[PDB]
Structure formats: structure tokens, C-alpha cells
UniProtKB/Swiss-Prot annotation, chain B:
Entry's family note: Belongs to the universal ribosomal protein uL10 family.
Function: Ribosomal protein P0 is the functional equivalent of E.coli protein L10.
Source organism phylogeny: Eukaryota, Metazoa, Chordata, Craniata, Vertebrata
Statement: the UniProt record of this protein carries the keyword Translocase: no
Keyword field: Cytoplasm, Isopeptide bond, Nucleus, Phosphoprotein, Ribonucleoprotein, Ribosomal protein, Ubl conjugation
Any one of the GO CC terms: nucleus
Organism: Oryctolagus cuniculus (Rabbit)
Modified residues (Phosphotyrosine): 20
Predominant cellular place of this UniProt entry's protein: nucleus
Name the record gives this protein: Large ribosomal subunit protein uL10
From Swiss-Prot, chain C:
Similarity section: Belongs to the universal ribosomal protein uL6 family.
Protein role: Component of the large ribosomal subunit. The ribosome is a large ribonucleoprotein complex responsible for the synthesis of proteins in the cell.
Single Gene Ontology MF annotation: rRNA binding
Protein name per UniProt: Large ribosomal subunit protein uL6
Quaternary data: Component of the large ribosomal subunit.
PROSITE patterns: RIBOSOMAL_L6_2 (PS00700)
Top-level lineage group: Eukaryota
Swiss-Prot record, chain D:
GO molecular function: large ribosomal subunit rRNA binding; structural constituent of ribosome
Matches recorded under Gene3D superfamilies: Ribosomal protein L11, C-terminal domain, Ribosomal protein L11/L12, N-terminal domain
Gene: RPL12
A family per Pfam: Ribosomal_L11
Family annotation (InterPro entries): Ribosomal_uL11 (IPR000911), Ribosomal_uL11_C (IPR020783), Ribosomal_uL11_C_sf (IPR036769), Ribosomal_uL11_CS (IPR020785), Ribosomal_uL11_N (IPR020784), Ribosomal_uL11_N_sf (IPR036796)
Protein source organism: Oryctolagus cuniculus (Rabbit)
Presence of the UniProt keyword RNA-binding in the record: yes
Protein name: Large ribosomal subunit protein uL11
Species lineage: Eukaryota, Metazoa, Chordata, Craniata, Vertebrata
Length: 52, 196, 190, 153
RNA sequence: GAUGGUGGCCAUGGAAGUCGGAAUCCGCUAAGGAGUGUGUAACAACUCACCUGCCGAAUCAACUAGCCCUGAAAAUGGAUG
């Protein structure tokens, strides 16, 4: 239904993100702490569970 | 630990150079461990091939220069993933043996294609249950005698192409891998001489 | 602490010529002339040596929050020099599942109209900022090429159309649709 | 045309799970008359995991067992096998001497993918602690033997 | 580049390292951990530790105290005077 390289290209801008636990910000995949100062730049992050 | 690992390596490179006044400076580039292990295991009785850190080998050379004033020629020739192989049997017999011991390696997805990989049209023995991988590449094929029949040949990858996962798996299924990497030895040291 | 001196130098190709008017810089090359203002960074720029081979940017007695600004100017200048000697070419590909994305170029690349995005009848018209040119490339099914001189304008235009091609009120982890920047490239290869 | 196919059987018992059909089916040779032949040809193991290579031609197949270090050491550690009851914790306890270790290493070097005898006895001594039995002691005791007190050819 | 003994052994319906309980070693080794993870009904495949190729001067970690920030939500418009 779609070409895999194009699919992963769309994933690189929509899927492989890191989400801050608090504030739920969307961050770059190689993140350490949240960009937002709203949550206080906390350290705990999650890998944004993909689609099953 | 690392401290003794450096010291005994210094001991074993000095000892190896003591009894072998003849060597080939061999660049073991893009060679699989499986191929290197079988080559070394087969050729252990005739020769010993040693690899290691280039910056450590050159310091060992400069440390032993006080007793061997003819080791300076090796210093400019140590750069890149290049090691040494020692033998005392003949001059070119091992060179021919190394040229003949090359093994075709599998096609890894992500490595550039060395040269001219293609697939001829033939009736394989894979079966009808694995046509989804051919549909990924878009290769038009038919099914005959219970297996997959290739209609026409195709140059899937040119010389100097990135190998994808779909092509690599297809090559693995067909048990064909023109990728052959062996010894690409550069120079020969023999009692203060350099040979191509 | 405050570092006494922090400087970096940038090489200048012979085909290009760069001059300084106070703190702003102007670069003239084969493709054209591009200018940029740095009146908010408070550094020193020196075009040392004849035949303008090197440009040195230094700062004296700066904290770590401002010593970082010394090298970002070097990147800006070298990126600008690349954009004037060779230019910037951003190639972005349209990704869709069922509905094809109809991209039409108007007023010689100034305006891009997007139709049939997720099948909706709404037409998305995005106006490129001045200084860039858009064209649907050949030798490919779906591809858009943005050619320009300054990365800010080129990538801002690419961001504009990419953000325009968005799916809302749905799961973006499945509806992988839109025009996405695939490769960052150069108009002229060295 | 000569074909070679590798299969895994459970010893002298006839394989209840039909795994010969997926392999021997495509060529047309009858797999049911070969699976039982392999089981009776192995025979002696009768309680272990066995790998068998099959040299199948266009007419008939040839049966021979591929040696395995784990399969040889477990049959060397002779113990009463457990039947269908199949309880837990059959962790083997025993003390196999060094004499038969050498001849098992002979079979290990028969196909010639190894170092010489002194290295093969060490790499099969590793299999000893892999299984669980000890040669009158563990490998910490059985390492010093290779140092100045060896009994290897 | 990242291997064999070996798909180590209790293991289980299928468990090749990636669900589990105890082991957790030898050869070739510059290096490969009976293994950190992504996945596989499970295999394959990707990837980490570790070793090398290129540039070459400094680089990590864990605490700790200062200022600032999140934590930090009430009603007539509002108070370092
Ligand atoms: Mg919804
Ligand atoms: Zn946050």
C-alpha cells in the first residue's frame, strides 16, 4: 500500500519521537531531558509506543 | 586488564618480529571474522597473521629501532585497517595461496556494492510461499513445477550501490553472493626491501 | 568564568568575495549577492590578510552563554558561502496511502497549490518567501525541489508546506501522509 | 544430482511430530519411511537431542548422525532416562574421568573445525560445566591441569 | 568488523541469547559478554558491550552547595508602600 522507505521517512517526522512524562512534549529521538521549561526540564522520558 | 593487555601485546609483537625477517603488510579491510578465522586456522602451520592497533605497532617499531635499524620503512606503510602476516617458506607461494583462499562473503544491507551483482533467469527451488519478497522488488516472475521461475535477468545493483535489506534477503534466499573480499596486501618486506 | 579571548576563523574560497560593513556581512558570488545582519550578537569581525583568504570572529570576556555565539556565526557565514557559491537544493517527497497529492506550481515557483490531500476538497496554497524557487522534478514520480541561497528561507518554505500537509484529529502513527523533506542537498556539486 | 538436508531428531524414538514431510515433501521422496529409519538407525541415544544429515539422491537417501559435543558428553554421563512422566530438574550429576574426554575430542576434531588436542579438551571442559557435571571438581580445579600437569597427547 | 565449541544445561507446545531458575567457560582471537536491547508463533534480521579505520588535546562520571525555574489553584481590581 506504500513504499517502505517513504513510510520510514514519514516515521522519522511522526513516529520515532521521545515524549516527556510530564507535560507530554514531543522531542527528538536522541533526547535526554525535556525542552519545555513548563515541566522543569525533567529527565524521565518514554519512547512513544509505536503501532501494533 | 588493559595495562597487562598492552604489555604482553608488546612482548608478543617483539617476539613475532624477532624470528620473522620477512613479512607482508596486509590490509584486512572488510573481511568477516568467519573468513579470517578459517584462513588463519587453515594456514596456521605455514604462516602467522597478526592484527592490532596501528599506533601501538608503530611505537613498538620505534621502540625496537635501537636494535633493528631497518624497520623505519614499515612506519609510513602503517595506516588504515592494516596488519602483518609472517612466514618463512618462500617468497610468492603464500601470496598465491592468499589470492586463492578468498571466500565470497554474504551481502550485508548497508554496505556498498563492490562490482556487478545481478541474477540470471532460472527456475529456483524456493517455492510459491515466498513470493512477497519478489513483489517487494517488483521483479515480474512466474511459478512453474512448484517453484519460482525468473523470466529475465536484471541488474538489481550496479557497481557502487547501497545494499538494501530487500535485496540482501533475496540474495540470501537465492544463495548467491558475488561479494568476495579477501587479502588486499599492499607491500612486502624482505630483509629491507619493498615489493608490490 | 570569563574567557579572555575566544576566536574562530573561516576560510574563504577564491571565487567568492565577502566584505564587512561594521558588524553585518555581505557575500558576493557566482549565483548572486547575499547579506546578513549581526547587530544583536556583539562580537568582532576581522577580514585579516590580503586577498581575503580568512575571516576571524572573536569575543573577549564572555560567559559560556555568549562564547557559544562565537562559532554559530562561523556556521552562518560558511553556510552562507555555500549557499552563494553552490546554492541550496532541498528535495522533499510526497507520501500518501490512497489519495494522490496533486501539487501545482504557480507564478514560477512563488506559489504552490496542494490538492487531494487525504481526499479533502480544501486547496492548500502556500506562498514561498522571496528568494526561493519551487519546481516538481523529473525522473521521479512525486518530488518537490526548492532552490535558494539562504538556508533559513529555503528550509522555512519547506517547513511551511510540510506543516500545511498535516493530519489532525486522527492517529499520526498510522496516517503517515504529507510532504516530508527527504534529502538536504546542493544545487551544484563540487 | 545429490542433495544434502539437515534435520533434528529426538533420538531412537520415532518422531511423532511430522517434521520430515515439510522437508522431504517437495522432492517427492517418502518421508515416513525415512523418519523411522533414522530413529532406528540412531537407536542408542534414545533420550537425547540428535542432529542427522541426510544425503538424499534422486533414488534413495543415506542416513548418518552429525556428532555433537553436548550429545556426546550427555551420553557419556550415563544415567537412567526418564519416561513420558517427564518431571522437572533432571540436572545431571556425575563425575566423568579424563580418559574418555580425549576420545570424544577425537570426534570433535574429526570434522576439523577446532585447534589441536590441547585446545579441544579445554573447549569440551567448558561443555562439562555447561552440562553441570564435574570431573572430580569444577573448571577452576580443572584449569591448572593444563598448566604444567597435563595428561594430553 | 562483532566467530566457533554450541541451537551449552533444567528447560517447553514452539524457545537458535533476547518469555523464565540456577551455570556463565575454552579455541581463533587486535574482539566478541553462553550476552544490553529492537523484534520473530521461532528462526532469520537490526542493535549494544568489546576490538579496529579517519581527525588529534584534553574527556567522563556521582555527590554537593549558591541565584533562578517547575512544583505553586479562589473568588469587587491590587500592591517589595
Ligand atoms: Mg480517532
Ligand atoms: Zn517536559
Amino acid at each position: 500500500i506504500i513504499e517502505p522507505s517513504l513510510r520510514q521517512l514519514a516515521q522519522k517526522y511522526n513516529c520515532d519521537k521521545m515524549i516527556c512524562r510530564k507535560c507530554y512534549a514531543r522531542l527528538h529521538p536522541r533526547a535526554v531531558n525535556c525542552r519545555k521549561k513548563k515541566c522543569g526540564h525533567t529527565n524521565n522520558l518514554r519512547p512513544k509506543k509505536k503501532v501494533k | 586488564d588493559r595495562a597487562t593487555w598492552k604489555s604482553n601485546y608488546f612482548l608478543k609483537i617483539i617476539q613475532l618480529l624477532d624470528d620473522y625477517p620477512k613479512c607482508f603488510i596486509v590490509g584486512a579491510d572488510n573481511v568477516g571474522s568467519k573468513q579470517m578465522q578459517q584462513i588463519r586456522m587453515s594456514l596456521r602451520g605455514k604462516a602467522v597473521v597478526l592484527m592490532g592497533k596501528n599506533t601501538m605497532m608503530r611505537k613498538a617499531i620505534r621502540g625496537h629501532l635501537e636494535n633493528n635499524p631497518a624497520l623505519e620503512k614499515l612506519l609510513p606503510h602503517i595506516r588504515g585497517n592494516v596488519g602483518f602476516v609472517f612466514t618463512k617458506e618462500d617468497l610468492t607461494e603464500i601470496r598465491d595461496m592468499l589470492l586463492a583462499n578468498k571466500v565470497p562473503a554474504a551481502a550485508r544491507a548497508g554496505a556498498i556494492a563492490p562490482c556487478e551483482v545481478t541474477v540470471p533467469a532460472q527456475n529456483t527451488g524456493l517455492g510459491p510461499e515466498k513470493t512477497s519478497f519478489f513483489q517487494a522488488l517488483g521483479i515480474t516472475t512466474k511459478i512453474s513445477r512448484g517453484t519460482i521461475e525468473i523470466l529475465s535477468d536484471v541488474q538489481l545493483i550496479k557497481t557502487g550501490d547501497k545494499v538494501g535489506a530487500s535485496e540482501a534477503t533475496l540474495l540470501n534466499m537465492l544463495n548467491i553472493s558475488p561479494f568476495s573480499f579477501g587479502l588486499i596486501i599492499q607491500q612486502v618486506f624482505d630483509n629491507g626491501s619493498i615489493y608490490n | 568564568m570569563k574567557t579572555i579571548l575566544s576566536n574562530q576563523t573561516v576560510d574563504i574560497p577564491e571565487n567568492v568575495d565577502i566584505s564587512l560593513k561594521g558588524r553585518t556581512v555581505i557575500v558576493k558570488g557566482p549565483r548572486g549577492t547575499l547579506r546578513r545582519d549581526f547587530n544583536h550578537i556583539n562580537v568582532e569581525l576581522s577580514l585579516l590578510g590580503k586577498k581575503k583568504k580568512r575571516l576571524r570572529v572573536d569575543k573577549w570576556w564572555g560567559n559560556r552563554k555568549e562564547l557559544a555565539t562565537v562559532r554559530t556565526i562561523c556556521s552562518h557565514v560558511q553556510n552562507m558561502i555555500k549557499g552563494v557559491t553552490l546554492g541550496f537544493r532541498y528535495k522533499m517527497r510526497s507520501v500518501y496511502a490512497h489519495f494522490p497529492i496533486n501539487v501545482v506550481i504557480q507564478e514560477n515557483g512563488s506559489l504552490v497549490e496542494i490538492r487531494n490531500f487525504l481526499g479533502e476538497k480544501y486547496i492548500r496554497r502556500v506562498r514561498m518567501r522571496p528568494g526561493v524557487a519551487c519546481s516538481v522534478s523529473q525522473a521521479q514520480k512525486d518530488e518537490l525541489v526548492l532552490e535558494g541561497n539562504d538556508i533559513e528561507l529555503v528550509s522555512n518554505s519547506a517547513a511551511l508546506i510540510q506543516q500545511a500537509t498535516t493530519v489532525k484529529n486522527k492517529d499520526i502513527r498510522k496516517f503517515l501522509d504529507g510532504i516530508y523533506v527527504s534529502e538536504k542537498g546542493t544545487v551544484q556539486q563540487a | 544430482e545429490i542433495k544434502v538436508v539437515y534435520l533434528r531428531c529426538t533420538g531412537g524414538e520415532v518422531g511423532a511430530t511430522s517434521a520430515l514431510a515439510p522437508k522431504i515433501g517437495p522432492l517427492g521422496l517418502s518421508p515416513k519411511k525415512v523418519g523411522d529409519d533414522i530413529a532406528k538407525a540412531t537407536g542408542d541415544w534414545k533420550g537425547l537431542r540428535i542432529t542427522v544429515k541426510l544425503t538424499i539422491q534422486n533414488r534413495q537417501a543415506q542416513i548418518e548422525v552429525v556428532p555433537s559435543a553436548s550429545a556426546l558428553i550427555i551420553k557419556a554421563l550415563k544415567e537412567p532416562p526418564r519416561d513420558r512422566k517427564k518431571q522437572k530438574n533432571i540436572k545431571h550429576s556425575g563425575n566423568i574421568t579424563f580418559d574418555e574426554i580425549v576420545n570424544i575430542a577425537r570426534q570433535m576434531r574429526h570434522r576439523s573445525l577446532a585447534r589441536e588436542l590441547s585446545g579441544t579438551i579445554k573447549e569440551i571442559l567448558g561443555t562439562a560445566q555447561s552440562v553441570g557435571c564435574n570431573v572430580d571438581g569444577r573448571h577452576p580445579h580443572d584449569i591448572i591441569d593444563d598448566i604444567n600437569s597435563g595428561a594430553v597427547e
